[PDB]
Amino acid sequence: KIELTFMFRGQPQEQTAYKNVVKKFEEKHPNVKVNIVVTSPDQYATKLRAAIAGRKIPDVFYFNPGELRAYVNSNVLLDITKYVENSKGVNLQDIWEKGVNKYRFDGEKVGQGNLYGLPKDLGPFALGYNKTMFEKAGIPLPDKDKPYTWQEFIDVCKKLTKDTNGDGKLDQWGTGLNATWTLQGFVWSNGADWIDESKTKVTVDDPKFIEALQFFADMQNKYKVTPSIAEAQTLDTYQRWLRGQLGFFPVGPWDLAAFDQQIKFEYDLIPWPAGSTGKPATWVGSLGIGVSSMTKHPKEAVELALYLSADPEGQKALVDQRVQLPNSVKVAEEWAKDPSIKPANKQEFLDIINDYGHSFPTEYTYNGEWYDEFYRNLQPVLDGKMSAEEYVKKAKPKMQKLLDQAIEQEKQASK
Ligand SMILES: OC[C@@H]1O[C@@H](OC[C@@H]2O[C@@H](O)[C@H](O)[C@H]2O)[C@H](O)[C@H]1O
Ligand SMILES: [Ca+2]
Structure with a gap:
């Protein structure tokens, strides 16, 4: 009886992976239906800008960390702090701090204060x-x-x-x-x-x-x-x-x-x-998963964003489908050490995140x-x-x- 629109971008394998994980979300929450709007990476910015210009904002969407302040000033992103705090056993403290903090804003500066999004991933190149x-x-x-x-x-x-x-x-x-x-x-x-x-x-x-x-x-x-x-x-x-x-x-x-x-x-x-x-x-790249300030279903919207960003089941499915490394720091460290998963030196990804990667x-x-x-x-x-x-x-x-x-x-x- 609840419908959410989820707007995102990806190469073909990513589109398939996230579509599969959204179906898993719909199995877990049979009262919520998620309608997908997906584009190629190069087409995304134009389509999202058009949605925002018309104030017809998808309930849940990818966004660029460099847009955080602008999106807060124009009341695009919902403050999801309380919904995340009240959520079932997720602890953002297990997630990369660098990732979480890109989507925090305290009214003056990025990196502290209220949550206006959740990290899709960290993307060391x-x-x-x-x-x-x-x-x-x-x-x-x-x-x-x-x-x-x-x-x-x-x-x-x-x-x-x-x-x-x-x-x-x-x-x-x-x-x-x-x-x-x-x-x-x-x-x-x-x-x-x-x-x-x-x-x-x-x-x-x-x-x-x-x-x-x-x-x-x-x-x-x-x-x-x-x-x-x-x-x-x-x-x-x-x-x-x-x-x-x-x-x-x-x-x-x-x-x-x-x-x-x-x-x-x-x-x-x-x-x-x-x-x-x-x-x-x-x-080190990142995208945020944000919730529309105007959404009619903020609890369910945050639940979807959480399922993709931090939920151990949603995350495991994404990592299994080979489109990102784990958002959980401890899970990522164990991942990197598993020699059955290639490349052999996938530790380099974590070395980039921890040591020599830049924004x-x-x-x-x-x-x-x-x-x-x-x-x-x-x-x-x-x-x-x-x-x-x-x-x-x-x-x-x-x-x-x-x-x-x-x-x-x-x-x-x-x-
Ligand atoms: O063109 C190959 C593609 O470009 C590089 O990734 C850059 C950028 O990052 C992702 O978020 C987008 O999908 C992509 O355009 C990589 O070399 C390869 O994925
Ligand atoms: Ca030749």
């Missing part, structure tokens, strides 16, 4: 390598703890780049990294960032940032350890990694089901190569438009048509104006 490829080539395996230097990384990528079937054409490459998701680690491990410590000034014109961005573009254009521009257009590097054509490619826990189904070679996880700091860097810069700002503008016009750098130095000088004032507006608009919306 690790580096994978193709072990089959290394062993066929006779190249010593990467170390599981000590990062390659950038020069060492290029050296091995060059050794992996070859014509394996002897037809005269390269058909295997060291890597093929997507700047949207992998530039951050090179920037951060080189002691740079998109914005300063105060999170109010754009710093992409830092020589350290420029060096990292130029090195990144140089993998394709100068060192030539990737498929060509045309080859990547023909078949993107994610697909080429699945087919066993690339030595290195990132791995997130959300990839594991897809990789189980499609990857036939052996692969394992390693630290990212490190720049001038000598310390590896990468990001996206937009998690700190009121909106992310300033950062989207950096990426919007980045491709000529990546394809060698414009230098990193020339681009960041051009982009910086456009980014700064947008960041300044985010800062101001925060002041005006929180009155």
Whole structure:
């Protein structure tokens, strides 16, 4: 007799996994029916923004931690603190503190106070390598703890780049990294960032940032350890990694089901190569599961969010279906130590969460438009048509104006 709308995003395997777990929820709560609105990851932001613009908000939905403050100011998210406190034996204290705290807001700052969402997951973005490829080539395996230097990384990528079937054409490459998701680690491990410590000034014109961005573009254009521009257009590097054509490619826990189904070679996880700091860097993603401020059924809505985030049965089903690592810290630690579950070094995921992972810069700002503008016009750098130095000088004032507006608009919306 109760109906909830649950809006979310995922790759195909994730959609299937969450749809299955929602059916489990419906079995446990036969009086609640959940109507699903699901999109691809790239389509999600536009569809959720449209729902919010029309004040027709789904009862339960994924959202970006960087939107928390804005969503609170516009009364989008219900304060679910009391519903969670009164809930049957769930203890958020077993859940990653870093995850829980992204969705707390005390009226002034994120990280403390009332709960406005529950963590879907934490998403450490690790580096994978193709072990089959290394062993066929006779190249010593990467170390599981000590990062390659950038020069060492290029050296091995060059050794992996070859014509394996002897037809005269390269058909295997060291890597093929997507700047949207992998530039951050090179920037951060080189002691740079998109914005300063105060999170109010754009710093992409830092020589350290420029060096990292130029090195990144140089993998394709100068060192030539990737498929060509045309080859990547023909078949993107994610697909080429699945087919066993690339030595290195990132791995997130959300990839594991897809990789189980499609990857036939052996692969394992390693630290990212490190720049001038000598310390590896990468990001830890997260999404929140929120409840509409306007929902007619707040108890049931929070029960669904809890079932996906913290309930041992709901969580076990998600982890079993290989679309995330456990939200419970103790369960995650035991998971990582189980050698029957691959990759062998899935401990690297926890090392990222605990030690060397960072947040996206937009998690700190009121909106992310300033950062989207950096990426919007980045491709000529990546394809060698414009230098990193020339681009960041051009982009910086456009980014700064947008960041300044985010800062101001925060002041005006929180009155
Ligand atoms: O394109 C391959 C895909 O991109 C990387 O993941 C980035 C991002 O994170 C998830 O939340 C979204 O599904 C995805 O677009 C990974 O390399 C791979 O999943
Ligand atoms: Ca060939």
